[PDB]
Amino acid sequence: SHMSAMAESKVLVKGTPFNKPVIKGKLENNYDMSQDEVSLLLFLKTHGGKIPLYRIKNETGLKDPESVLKNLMDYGFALEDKERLGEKIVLTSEGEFVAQAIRVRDEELRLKEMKQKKNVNR
């Protein structure tokens, strides 16, 4: 009942040289992730896609960081690289893909809104 308690994978097809990854859900709805999950995914992306677990506990502002992280792992976006003297959390290639897609969408919106304040259209 351990594997059945897990959330469903969002990785349909992992990326390879001849294909982009196919992710369940759509970017417009953050691939069905809740906001806490999106926040954590972007936090991981912002810190190089690799970071000690204790930093996640201390720095994200989440009440239950481990639960949020386990969902990202179940989705196929992150994994544990446990090693001598502590565990390291790393984004998978699919997690990097999704994190970057969301970051770019967010930035395009920020740029659009910035351009509306004063016309400097080239």
Backbone as JSON, one array per atom type, in Angstrom:
{
  "sequence": "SHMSAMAESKVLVKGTPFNKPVIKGKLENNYDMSQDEVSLLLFLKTHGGKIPLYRIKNETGLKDPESVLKNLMDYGFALEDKERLGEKIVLTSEGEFVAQAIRVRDEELRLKEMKQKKNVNR",
  "N": [[0.85, -1.22, 0.0], [2.18, 1.05, -0.09], [3.21, 1.99, -2.51], [0.8, 2.54, -3.71], [-0.22, 4.65, -2.34], [1.04, 6.76, -3.29], [1.22, 9.75, -5.32], [0.05, 10.18, -8.67], [2.28, 9.7, -11.48], [3.48, 12.44, -13.45], [4.92, 12.33, -15.62], [4.81, 11.41, -18.8], [6.26, 10.78, -21.08], [9.67, 10.66, -20.99], [12.14, 13.15, -21.69], [14.34, 13.01, -24.54], [17.05, 12.92, -26.94], [15.6, 12.94, -29.41], [13.02, 13.82, -28.84], [10.85, 16.0, -27.02], [9.96, 16.31, -23.55], [6.85, 14.75, -22.51], [4.34, 15.88, -20.64], [1.81, 15.27, -18.23], [-1.25, 17.0, -18.04], [-1.51, 20.62, -18.35], [0.5, 23.5, -19.08], [-0.85, 25.95, -18.68], [-2.38, 25.46, -16.41], [-0.53, 24.94, -14.52], [0.26, 22.27, -14.79], [-1.5, 20.83, -13.23], [-0.51, 21.02, -10.63], [-0.52, 22.07, -7.21], [-0.36, 25.37, -5.72], [1.63, 25.42, -3.65], [3.29, 23.33, -4.42], [4.27, 24.26, -6.87], [5.62, 26.53, -6.0], [7.68, 25.24, -4.45], [8.97, 23.71, -6.47], [10.0, 25.75, -8.12], [11.67, 26.93, -6.29], [13.6, 24.97, -5.99], [14.61, 25.0, -8.6], [15.62, 27.56, -8.75], [17.77, 27.39, -7.01], [19.86, 26.07, -8.4], [18.79, 23.51, -9.12], [19.56, 21.49, -7.44], [20.02, 20.68, -4.07], [20.65, 20.63, -0.4], [18.56, 18.68, 1.84], [18.02, 19.87, 4.35], [18.04, 22.62, 3.78], [15.72, 23.0, 2.39], [13.83, 22.58, 4.35], [14.34, 24.68, 6.09], [14.27, 27.09, 4.53], [11.95, 27.49, 2.68], [9.4, 28.34, 3.62], [7.27, 26.7, 3.95], [4.8, 24.74, 5.64], [4.83, 21.95, 5.76], [7.2, 20.89, 4.26], [8.4, 18.46, 3.47], [6.18, 16.87, 2.74], [5.23, 18.23, 0.53], [7.45, 18.03, -1.15], [7.54, 15.2, -1.46], [5.33, 14.85, -3.09], [6.27, 16.11, -5.46], [8.27, 14.33, -6.05], [6.82, 11.96, -6.5], [5.47, 12.8, -8.76], [7.46, 12.72, -10.63], [9.27, 14.73, -10.9], [11.39, 15.36, -9.2], [14.09, 14.03, -7.22], [15.73, 12.0, -4.69], [19.11, 12.15, -3.77], [20.68, 10.62, -1.86], [23.54, 10.82, 0.15], [26.79, 10.32, 1.72], [26.8, 11.88, 4.8], [24.27, 13.31, 4.77], [21.19, 14.01, 2.88], [20.6, 14.89, -0.54], [18.6, 16.89, -2.62], [17.41, 16.73, -5.91], [16.43, 18.08, -9.09], [14.73, 16.32, -11.64], [15.36, 15.74, -15.16], [12.9, 16.19, -16.3], [11.61, 17.64, -14.32], [13.15, 19.94, -14.36], [12.54, 20.84, -16.9], [9.74, 21.42, -16.64], [9.8, 23.31, -14.61], [11.28, 25.34, -15.81], [9.55, 26.0, -17.96], [7.37, 27.07, -16.6], [8.64, 29.19, -15.32], [9.41, 30.77, -17.5], [6.86, 31.36, -18.64], [5.8, 32.86, -16.54], [7.61, 35.02, -16.47], [7.21, 36.14, -19.01], [4.71, 37.21, -18.63], [5.3, 39.08, -16.67], [6.94, 40.83, -18.07], [5.18, 41.77, -20.01], [3.34, 43.17, -18.4], [5.03, 45.08, -17.34], [5.64, 46.57, -19.56], [3.25, 47.9, -20.0], [3.09, 50.05, -18.26], [4.52, 52.41, -19.11], [4.88, 53.62, -22.33], [7.36, 52.31, -24.27], [7.67, 50.99, -26.48], [9.39, 49.45, -29.08]],
  "CA": [[0.0, 0.0, 0.0], [3.13, 2.16, -0.11], [3.22, 2.49, -3.87], [-0.54, 2.99, -4.09], [-0.49, 5.89, -1.62], [1.75, 7.79, -4.02], [0.47, 10.5, -6.31], [0.34, 9.67, -10.0], [3.35, 10.34, -12.23], [3.05, 13.39, -14.47], [5.83, 12.18, -16.73], [4.28, 10.45, -19.78], [7.42, 10.41, -21.87], [10.84, 11.43, -20.58], [12.79, 13.76, -22.83], [15.52, 12.34, -25.11], [17.5, 13.71, -28.09], [14.63, 13.03, -30.5], [11.69, 14.2, -28.36], [10.68, 16.87, -25.86], [9.17, 15.48, -22.64], [5.42, 14.95, -22.57], [3.9, 16.0, -19.25], [0.36, 15.19, -18.05], [-1.71, 18.32, -17.65], [-1.14, 21.74, -19.21], [1.21, 24.64, -18.48], [-1.79, 26.97, -18.25], [-2.89, 25.17, -15.05], [0.64, 24.45, -13.8], [0.27, 20.8, -14.86], [-2.32, 20.38, -12.11], [0.14, 21.12, -9.33], [-1.09, 23.11, -6.37], [0.64, 26.45, -5.64], [2.74, 25.06, -2.78], [4.17, 22.49, -5.21], [4.91, 25.11, -7.85], [6.61, 27.3, -5.23], [8.83, 24.42, -4.13], [9.67, 23.37, -7.7], [10.76, 26.93, -8.55], [12.72, 27.15, -5.29], [14.65, 24.04, -6.36], [15.17, 25.45, -9.86], [16.37, 28.79, -8.42], [18.99, 26.99, -6.34], [20.59, 25.14, -9.24], [18.2, 22.2, -9.34], [20.22, 20.55, -6.53], [20.18, 21.32, -2.75], [20.49, 19.76, 0.78], [17.21, 18.67, 2.37], [17.83, 20.81, 5.45], [17.76, 23.97, 3.3], [14.31, 23.01, 2.01], [13.08, 22.71, 5.59], [14.57, 26.0, 6.66], [14.07, 28.24, 3.67], [10.82, 27.66, 1.78], [8.2, 28.93, 4.19], [6.23, 25.69, 3.93], [4.53, 24.07, 6.91], [5.22, 20.56, 5.66], [8.04, 20.81, 3.06], [8.58, 17.07, 3.07], [5.0, 16.36, 2.06], [5.2, 18.88, -0.78], [8.54, 17.41, -1.91], [7.15, 13.84, -1.84], [4.46, 14.94, -4.27], [7.11, 16.39, -6.62], [8.98, 13.09, -6.37], [5.83, 11.05, -7.06], [5.15, 13.28, -10.12], [8.6, 12.47, -11.49], [10.0, 15.99, -11.08], [12.54, 15.48, -8.32], [14.47, 12.79, -6.56], [16.72, 12.06, -3.61], [20.45, 11.67, -4.06], [21.25, 10.47, -0.52], [24.97, 10.58, 0.16], [27.54, 10.5, 2.95], [26.57, 13.1, 5.58], [23.07, 14.05, 4.4], [20.53, 13.78, 1.6], [20.57, 15.99, -1.51], [17.39, 16.83, -3.46], [17.73, 17.21, -7.25], [15.34, 18.04, -10.06], [14.99, 15.41, -12.77], [15.32, 16.53, -16.39], [11.5, 16.57, -16.51], [11.3, 18.69, -13.36], [13.82, 21.15, -14.86], [11.72, 21.25, -18.04], [8.5, 22.01, -16.18], [10.15, 24.5, -13.82], [11.67, 26.38, -16.77], [8.36, 26.4, -18.71], [6.6, 27.92, -15.71], [9.42, 30.43, -15.11], [9.29, 31.58, -18.73], [5.49, 31.88, -18.74], [5.68, 33.9, -15.53], [8.42, 36.17, -16.88], [6.55, 36.79, -20.16], [3.64, 38.0, -18.08], [5.91, 40.21, -15.95], [7.41, 41.77, -19.09], [3.98, 42.37, -20.6], [2.81, 44.11, -17.43], [6.0, 46.15, -17.2], [5.49, 47.39, -20.78], [2.0, 48.65, -19.93], [3.25, 51.23, -17.4], [5.02, 53.55, -19.88], [5.16, 53.14, -23.68], [8.72, 52.37, -24.78], [7.61, 50.02, -27.57], [10.39, 49.61, -30.14]],
  "C": [[0.87, 1.25, 0.0], [3.13, 2.81, -1.48], [1.87, 3.02, -4.33], [-0.93, 4.3, -3.41], [0.16, 7.07, -2.34], [0.88, 8.5, -5.02], [0.88, 9.94, -7.66], [1.48, 10.41, -10.7], [2.79, 11.32, -13.24], [3.97, 13.27, -15.67], [5.34, 11.04, -17.64], [5.41, 9.89, -20.62], [8.58, 11.29, -21.43], [11.47, 12.01, -21.83], [14.03, 12.98, -23.25], [15.91, 13.22, -26.29], [16.51, 13.88, -29.24], [13.19, 13.37, -30.08], [11.72, 15.0, -27.08], [9.87, 16.03, -24.86], [7.68, 15.75, -22.81], [5.0, 14.83, -21.12], [2.37, 15.97, -19.21], [-0.1, 16.55, -17.55], [-1.18, 19.36, -18.62], [-0.46, 22.85, -18.44], [0.25, 25.71, -17.96], [-2.35, 26.71, -16.84], [-1.77, 24.55, -14.21], [0.71, 22.93, -13.72], [-0.44, 20.18, -13.68], [-1.66, 20.38, -10.74], [-0.55, 22.21, -8.53], [0.0, 24.18, -6.23], [1.85, 26.15, -4.75], [3.77, 24.23, -3.56], [4.94, 23.3, -6.24], [5.98, 25.94, -7.13], [7.87, 26.47, -4.92], [9.65, 24.05, -5.38], [10.55, 24.54, -8.18], [11.88, 27.23, -7.56], [13.89, 26.23, -5.67], [15.37, 24.5, -7.63], [16.07, 26.66, -9.62], [17.7, 28.49, -7.75], [19.74, 25.89, -7.08], [20.03, 23.76, -9.51], [18.82, 21.11, -8.48], [20.51, 21.24, -5.19], [19.99, 20.36, -1.54], [19.06, 19.8, 1.33], [17.01, 19.68, 3.5], [17.56, 22.24, 4.96], [16.28, 24.08, 2.91], [13.45, 23.21, 3.25], [13.16, 24.1, 6.17], [14.12, 27.2, 5.84], [12.84, 28.46, 2.79], [9.56, 28.31, 2.31], [7.01, 27.99, 4.19], [6.04, 25.02, 5.27], [4.97, 22.61, 6.9], [5.96, 20.39, 4.33], [8.21, 19.39, 2.55], [7.39, 16.5, 2.33], [4.93, 16.95, 0.65], [6.26, 18.23, -1.69], [8.16, 15.99, -2.35], [6.21, 13.86, -3.02], [5.3, 15.2, -5.53], [7.88, 15.15, -7.03], [8.03, 12.09, -7.04], [5.49, 11.49, -8.5], [6.26, 12.99, -11.13], [9.45, 13.71, -11.74], [11.24, 16.19, -10.22], [12.87, 14.13, -7.73], [15.5, 13.03, -5.49], [18.02, 11.43, -4.03], [21.12, 11.58, -2.68], [22.72, 10.09, -0.59], [25.6, 10.88, 1.5], [27.36, 11.88, 3.58], [25.36, 13.95, 5.18], [22.49, 13.78, 3.02], [20.45, 15.06, 0.77], [19.33, 15.81, -2.39], [17.73, 17.43, -4.82], [16.54, 17.12, -8.18], [15.72, 17.03, -11.13], [14.98, 16.29, -14.02], [13.9, 17.01, -16.65], [11.09, 17.69, -15.54], [11.94, 20.0, -13.81], [13.0, 21.72, -16.01], [10.46, 22.01, -17.6], [8.77, 23.31, -15.44], [10.51, 25.64, -14.77], [10.45, 26.89, -17.56], [7.52, 27.37, -17.89], [7.32, 29.25, -15.5], [9.28, 31.34, -16.32], [7.9, 32.16, -18.88], [5.33, 33.04, -17.76], [6.42, 35.18, -15.92], [7.79, 36.89, -18.07], [5.42, 37.67, -19.65], [4.18, 39.24, -17.36], [6.37, 41.27, -16.95], [6.24, 42.5, -19.72], [3.42, 43.46, -19.7], [3.72, 45.31, -17.23], [5.84, 47.12, -18.37], [4.24, 48.27, -20.79], [2.08, 49.94, -19.12], [3.65, 52.52, -18.11], [5.39, 53.0, -21.26], [6.58, 53.39, -24.16], [8.82, 51.33, -25.89], [8.53, 50.4, -28.71], [9.87, 49.18, -31.51]]
}
